[PDB]
Amino acid sequence: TPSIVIASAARTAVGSFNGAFANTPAHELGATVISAVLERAGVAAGEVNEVILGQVLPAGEGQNPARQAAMKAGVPQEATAWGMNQLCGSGLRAVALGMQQIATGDASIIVAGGMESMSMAPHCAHLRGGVKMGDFKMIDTMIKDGLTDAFYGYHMGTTAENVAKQWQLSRDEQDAFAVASQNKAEAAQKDGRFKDEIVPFIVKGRKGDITVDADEYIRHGATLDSMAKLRPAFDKEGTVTAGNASGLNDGAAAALLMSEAEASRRGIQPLGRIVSWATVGVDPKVMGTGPIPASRKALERAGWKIGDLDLVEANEAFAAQACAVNKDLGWDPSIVNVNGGAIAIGHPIGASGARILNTLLFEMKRRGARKGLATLCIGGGMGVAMCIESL
Amino acid sequence: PSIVIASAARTAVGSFNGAFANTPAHELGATVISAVLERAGVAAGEVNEVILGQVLPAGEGQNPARQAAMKAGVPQEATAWGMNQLCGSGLRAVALGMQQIATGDASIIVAGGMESMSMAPHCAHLRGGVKMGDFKMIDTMIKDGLTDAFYGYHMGTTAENVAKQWQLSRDEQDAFAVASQNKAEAAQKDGRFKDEIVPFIVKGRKGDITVDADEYIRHGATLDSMAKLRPAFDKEGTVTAGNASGLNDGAAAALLMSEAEASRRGIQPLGRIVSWATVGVDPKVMGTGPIPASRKALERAGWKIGDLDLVEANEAFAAQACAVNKDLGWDPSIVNVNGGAIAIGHPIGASGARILNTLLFEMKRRGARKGLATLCIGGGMGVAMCIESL
Amino acid sequence: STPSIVIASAARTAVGSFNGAFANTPAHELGATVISAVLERAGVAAGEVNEVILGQVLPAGEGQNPARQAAMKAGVPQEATAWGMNQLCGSGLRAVALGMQQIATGDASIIVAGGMESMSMAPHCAHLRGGVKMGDFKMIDTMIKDGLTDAFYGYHMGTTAENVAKQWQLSRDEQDAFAVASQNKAEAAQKDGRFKDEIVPFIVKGRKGDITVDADEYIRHGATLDSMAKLRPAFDKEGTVTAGNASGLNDGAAAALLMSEAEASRRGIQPLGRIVSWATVGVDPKVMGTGPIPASRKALERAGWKIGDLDLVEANEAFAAQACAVNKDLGWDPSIVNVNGGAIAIGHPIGASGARILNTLLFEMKRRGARKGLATLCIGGGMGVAMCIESL
Amino acid sequence: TPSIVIASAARTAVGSFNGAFANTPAHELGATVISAVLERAGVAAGEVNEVILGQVLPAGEGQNPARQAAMKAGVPQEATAWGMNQLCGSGLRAVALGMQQIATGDASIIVAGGMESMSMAPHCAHLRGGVKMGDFKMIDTMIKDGLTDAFYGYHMGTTAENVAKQWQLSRDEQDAFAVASQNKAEAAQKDGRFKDEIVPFIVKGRKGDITVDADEYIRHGATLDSMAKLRPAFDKEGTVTAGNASGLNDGAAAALLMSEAEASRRGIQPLGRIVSWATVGVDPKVMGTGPIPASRKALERAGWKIGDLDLVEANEAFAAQACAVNKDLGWDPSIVNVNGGAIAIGHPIGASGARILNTLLFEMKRRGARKGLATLCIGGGMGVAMCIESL
Ligand SMILES: CC(C)(C)C(=O)OCC(C)(C)[C@@H](O)C(=O)NCCC(=O)NCCO
Numbered sequence A, D: 001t002p003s004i005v006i007a008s009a010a011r012t013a014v015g016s017f018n019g020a021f022a023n024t025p026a027h028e029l030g031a032t033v034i035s036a037v038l039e040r041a042g043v044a045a046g047e048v049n050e051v052i053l054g055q056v057l058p059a060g061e062g063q064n065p066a067r068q069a070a071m072k073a074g075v076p077q078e079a080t081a082w083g084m085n086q087l088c089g090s091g092l093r094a095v096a097l098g099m100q101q102i103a104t105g106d107a108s109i110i111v112a113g114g115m116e117s118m119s120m121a122p123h124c125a126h127l128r129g130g131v132k133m134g135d136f137k138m139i140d141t142m143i144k145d146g147l148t149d150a151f152y153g154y155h156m157g158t159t160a161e162n163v164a165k166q167w168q169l170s171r172d173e174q175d176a177f178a179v180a181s182q183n184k185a186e187a188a189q190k191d192g193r194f195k196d197e198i199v200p201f202i203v204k205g206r207k208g209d210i211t212v213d214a215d216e217y218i219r220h221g222a223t224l225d226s227m228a229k230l231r232p233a234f235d236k237e238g239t240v241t242a243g244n245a246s247g248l249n250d251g252a253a254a255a256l257l258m259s260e261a262e263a264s265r266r267g268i269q270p271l272g273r274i275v276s277w278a279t280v281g282v283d284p285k286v287m288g289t290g291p292i293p294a295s296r297k298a299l300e301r302a303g304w305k306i307g308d309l310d311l312v313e314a315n316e317a318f319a320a321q322a323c324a325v326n327k328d329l330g331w332d333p334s335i336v337n338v339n340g341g342a343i344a345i346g347h348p349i350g351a352s353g354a355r356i357l358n359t360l361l362f363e364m365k366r367r368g369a370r371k372g373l374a375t376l377c378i379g380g381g382m383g384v385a386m387c388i389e390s391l
Numbered sequence B: 001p002s003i004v005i006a007s008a009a010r011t012a013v014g015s016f017n018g019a020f021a022n023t024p025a026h027e028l029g030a031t032v033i034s035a036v037l038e039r040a041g042v043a044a045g046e047v048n049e050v051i052l053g054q055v056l057p058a059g060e061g062q063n064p065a066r067q068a069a070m071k072a073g074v075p076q077e078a079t080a081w082g083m084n085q086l087c088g089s090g091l092r093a094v095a096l097g098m099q100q101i102a103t104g105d106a107s108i109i110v111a112g113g114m115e116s117m118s119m120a121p122h123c124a125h126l127r128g129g130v131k132m133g134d135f136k137m138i139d140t141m142i143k144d145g146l147t148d149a150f151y152g153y154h155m156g157t158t159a160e161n162v163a164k165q166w167q168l169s170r171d172e173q174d175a176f177a178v179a180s181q182n183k184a185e186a187a188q189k190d191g192r193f194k195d196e197i198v199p200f201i202v203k204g205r206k207g208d209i210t211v212d213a214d215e216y217i218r219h220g221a222t223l224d225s226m227a228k229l230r231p232a233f234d235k236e237g238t239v240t241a242g243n244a245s246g247l248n249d250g251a252a253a254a255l256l257m258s259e260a261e262a263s264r265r266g267i268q269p270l271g272r273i274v275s276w277a278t279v280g281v282d283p284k285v286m287g288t289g290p291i292p293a294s295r296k297a298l299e300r301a302g303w304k305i306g307d308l309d310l311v312e313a314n315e316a317f318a319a320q321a322c323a324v325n326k327d328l329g330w331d332p333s334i335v336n337v338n339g340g341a342i343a344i345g346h347p348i349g350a351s352g353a354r355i356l357n358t359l360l361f362e363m364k365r366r367g368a369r370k371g372l373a374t375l376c377i378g379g380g381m382g383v384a385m386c387i388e389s390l
Numbered sequence C: 001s002t003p004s005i006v007i008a009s010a011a012r013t014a015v016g017s018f019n020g021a022f023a024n025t026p027a028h029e030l031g032a033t034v035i036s037a038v039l040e041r042a043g044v045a046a047g048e049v050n051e052v053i054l055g056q057v058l059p060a061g062e063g064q065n066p067a068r069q070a071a072m073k074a075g076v077p078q079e080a081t082a083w084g085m086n087q088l089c090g091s092g093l094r095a096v097a098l099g100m101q102q103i104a105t106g107d108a109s110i111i112v113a114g115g116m117e118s119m120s121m122a123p124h125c126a127h128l129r130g131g132v133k134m135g136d137f138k139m140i141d142t143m144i145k146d147g148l149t150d151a152f153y154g155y156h157m158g159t160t161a162e163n164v165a166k167q168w169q170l171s172r173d174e175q176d177a178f179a180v181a182s183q184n185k186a187e188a189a190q191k192d193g194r195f196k197d198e199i200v201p202f203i204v205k206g207r208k209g210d211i212t213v214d215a216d217e218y219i220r221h222g223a224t225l226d227s228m229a230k231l232r233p234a235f236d237k238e239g240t241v242t243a244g245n246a247s248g249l250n251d252g253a254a255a256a257l258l259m260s261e262a263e264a265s266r267r268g269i270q271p272l273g274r275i276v277s278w279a280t281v282g283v284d285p286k287v288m289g290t291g292p293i294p295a296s297r298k299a300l301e302r303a304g305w306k307i308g309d310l311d312l313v314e315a316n317e318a319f320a321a322q323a324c325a326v327n328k329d330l331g332w333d334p335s336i337v338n339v340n341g342g343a344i345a346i347g348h349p350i351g352a353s354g355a356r357i358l359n360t361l362l363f364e365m366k367r368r369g370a371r372k373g374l375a376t377l378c379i380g381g382g383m384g385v386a387m388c389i390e391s392l
């Protein structure tokens, strides 16, 4: 039976919408995190067989941004590279697909994760037939391909409203969660707890280079009071807001995968062993519920009980969905997103899953936690989870 | 573990802005997913996941593979995703699904690709705003589909790079291009695309239309019409519109499950996937990709090139295809025996699935035991897969 | 003494169908041909022109001051001046009045005035300086936004036409009859050769070959009442205004060469007529189709003429509804109005149309020996313009 | 012989490109100016017969923005309104066209001037035929329709270079002229000499309203070094720079006209009598020279010697051309642009002629100057000039 480990991991800092990485292509963030995982494990880029990168918004970035990130990071032309999209779950799914390359004896060494620049996502219009008369729409690919449900036509925060309404979650419980997430994240940030996992990214300029190594979306000094001031963002009589939903963000995150025997040959002390993963579908109207069956399915594959977990990363798309998952699964809230979650840190879609996985792995190392789980809800109604055990 | 293609279908390939000009990728996809399941006698609710290659999803809305999956009646309980190894995606998707089943993560996968090159939008990054001066609206089909990221030239320059390395004449490529069209029109009229094709109904306020014939194929392709073309990518070059593939829309897919499961279901499978591989090569000469990827596939399959009874070798260009034939040295009589992509079309993300459909349906038709399918990929890669009939 | 300005010569292009003969012909190219024509027809050299004044509503993307481009192409010397203006549909006729003014005030002696438009070449646009930080945005059709949508109510000109239909209680059958009659008069005029004199042929250059355009391509031959009756209302589901009883989207240019009556006489020119009066008046934007009514009345007052004194009238047909309303109110003999058909048939190249219908008026007055004529048009945003012309 | 007076005048402050009026439609600036001239004259909007506004870049603003300005200002629906374009000359030419309406007996009271929002000018593409395959250009209407010569394809700054070379104008002379403009305009602004002309414009905003009543393009404390440091903008061995050229700017300006008799009936002390005007063509290659023949012709028509002039506003498109004009005409530089010119104040194309007219009229009144001239050069090779006498 195969046994495949995460030798090393790294992520950029998460940028704010049109913030520090306003003009930085996804593959540029990508390339930095690929070299980082390689440098962090002591493996030469020339030893990478394949690079697999989750990416949702690749339009106008040119052929196969995954190969562009690979090549820029000095992975040789002889390797291969590709991109995939299971939306919010992409960056974590790519890690599982990579494990599969190795488990099936198709590859010995894989870099997998996700990259996303929501800033650089273009506006678009189908224009071949030509517009003989009348206005036409220039469509925001970020919104269209990222945040709009393809079946109901409404946005993801409307699905959060559905989940909020199902689980009867008050504005106050969602806001209390929100401020909790920010507070946890600003603590982690100041306490230095993101330094291990973040690789500085340098933003080249004519005016001068700017090194980015801090998560800029975290609100310092978030108060309940500030939270309670905001209007509902998707339903005039709704409870979801910009304060209790994640944001629009840019980042990359990756992990270096290989067999347990290989890490041991190379003297690598891996960050974890992938014991299981799972993906499952649910109603797109309540996609926030995804992590409930996916986590349960991952745990079933891992042969674990929910109580076995020492650390969880359950992605925070919206406070409504996040509370609901925590409610349903019944895991100790104190072990969930202990350094804050996406509401504070941001949600760079295709990278999110590799982002939270990074956070899980380094905090597991940090606390000496043995068993851990990452899970995300996925637009269109899915969830993905992955179980990790320390070596 | 032993994973078989239970069934397989593809849409006809449409010419650029032709039959499918205003058809979303995911609708062509939904037709192919349903057709695989119907042909296999498998309930859609039995499907674990749908994996679709697609290179050009801008404007089409969240995760078009799931939109196809849902439009095909696969329940909300299944999963779906898209992937891009450019021209390899459609075949890579099938490898990826086989892995899902090999690792015990799924029982039944629908894998393939879908593309609408006609529906690809123009785009510009516009958040920062253009404070003054002109800007370019970018054809995402060209940028994200056929333009090499590293050198910034089209895929037709690479083919010229390969024409000049393998020293392939303009005569030879026209000999190849006419030969391809002839086979495709022969095969078409002969009724050899019927099995693999599932018809697609294009809905309209003027009337529905049923597309069930490949429309990019030229009838009565003469060398003259080839030799009358000017070079498209270099003023002194040998690559042309006639000895290169087209821009196209279409979809293709396979139903995967274990061999054991196919036997519980009493399904007579189209083939057993014996091996596959992907490999990298100089992006400048990307069309060579099928060489290392077919050799690895074959080494991984424990086969010799002399073992193959049939090969499908994607003709992105005549120069890259001739060169692969030249180096691999297989019998050119068993290669693309019903024509190729120059004749048929190259719907980027579907193409690997396309050429698999053709490979599998013709191995049945003539009773070939072994087949290899292979593609070159923008940026310099090759994918290949080895299919043994049951 | 009170100045007397004549129209020494006039010309127009054939009017092109939307995305038709002139699909890719910039407006100033049409204009250049027409400027060349009026000079030729008057025996006046381009070197003698003082100013060119061209109405033009949709100049976006054509570059700096397309009037000047038209003039320079036509060989008008760099020492002359040229400018464009925009009083919407009224533009081409107002230009002619503004030309007259230049001469009357002693600032010029010889002016080419009229208008030009390429609706087909009108671009789509969007303001993108500040970025679109998130969310979809519209690429606006400049033709629709700047030419055909009311700026105050936000609806299209055809809704204003519905408004007039309703106020004047004009039936669908009445409007349809008017529109068929327009088509049939224009077809008849065309087949008889009555537009030859006014039309200067336009050569559309290509690579595949040149094509000479000298027929109005929008006129429907053999137009049937059934063809009109079958159409759905285009602006109100329970309305009466249709694509068939409205004018179209068209390309074209048209112009007149002006000079003092004394200067014409020196040169030995037999002018097409004397400008005796003009006027422009405003009305409610909601019923802008009504502009011709006060504009005409004022023009006549200023001329010292009664409605009954008119021998010919060109009253522009933006829509059958407003056309009918104007004729009903003014009470002029419909048999003297748009005798060669009107815009429903011929087309409506916005900034050119006033000069176009002036062309038609002048050449018909000449043809039939009519002494007194009037040209009038309604104007988007609630205005009218009218000019009175007398034979000399 | 008819005698037409300018009863009153007003202008907006001139905004910087994408500055104070970045999102203000030209017709909103024009309305405020229309309301102002009416206020200043004591004439009610009900009395206005026609509004005539020069405007070079109306694309996307809707039907006949002149009418939109007139209606917003309360000018009755029975009045009429129209736009015109003779490029830079347009605001001034509008005033002459107004004059003509009165002189020929067609109107009694006219508001004429110009308005321009270079900021709001869109980008455009002809898309009716479709673009079957390949990239296409989105054209900046501001550059295309406002600033590029239609015959030679180069920008107006290249015309200014042509004039530099022909008149042998050093980069030092041009920089000195531009510094002097800035320093004159700063002085005038600090002394309050633009207050009388400027009508404040309220920029409405959710986050509050902003009152704009100072010319924001004027550089305070402009140094010769700052000019000397600049690279030539139009030819690598050129002399014309962003510093010795005017800018891209927003604004409106207008004058209310009536007959001298009508003003006397109303008891109005007018800003000046229109004594003459002229417009002439020159080679487009050297369009900056237009003022030369235009001014000479206007002076001839007025029966005035250049020496007779007490004040001159000669528009400063570029230092090069402004210097050539002054050299040729020979008028005392100390009477020209005494409060600075466009290089400092800005160049809102279709309003600029009316702007400089405003500045002339208010300074003539201020200093008791009897005879004034306003002149501008015009893209495509023309000039326009106007002679004004105090009453
Ligand atoms: C008003 C417009 C042009 C947006 C529209 O509704 O579609 C236009 C059609 C399809 C009705 C077309 O037949 C048409 O051009 N109708 C006339 C439009 C129009 O207002 N023309 C100018 C009349 O003054």
Ligand SMILES: CC(C)(C)C(=O)OCC(C)(C)[C@@H](O)C(=O)NCCC(=O)NCCO
Pocket (backbone or CB within 6 Å): B132, D143, D147, D155, D156, D157, D233, D241, D242, D245, D246, D247, D248, D316, D317, D318, D347
């Ligand atoms: C002239 C233009 C706009 C094409 C250009 O060179 O870029 C703009 C800059 C930023 C370089 C700068 O020189 C500028 O603002 N130019 C505009 C100069 C101009 O035409 N001014 C009008 C003078 O009346």
Ligand code: NA
Pocket (backbone or CB within 6 Å): D023, D024, D025, D028, D204
């Ligand atoms: Na505003």
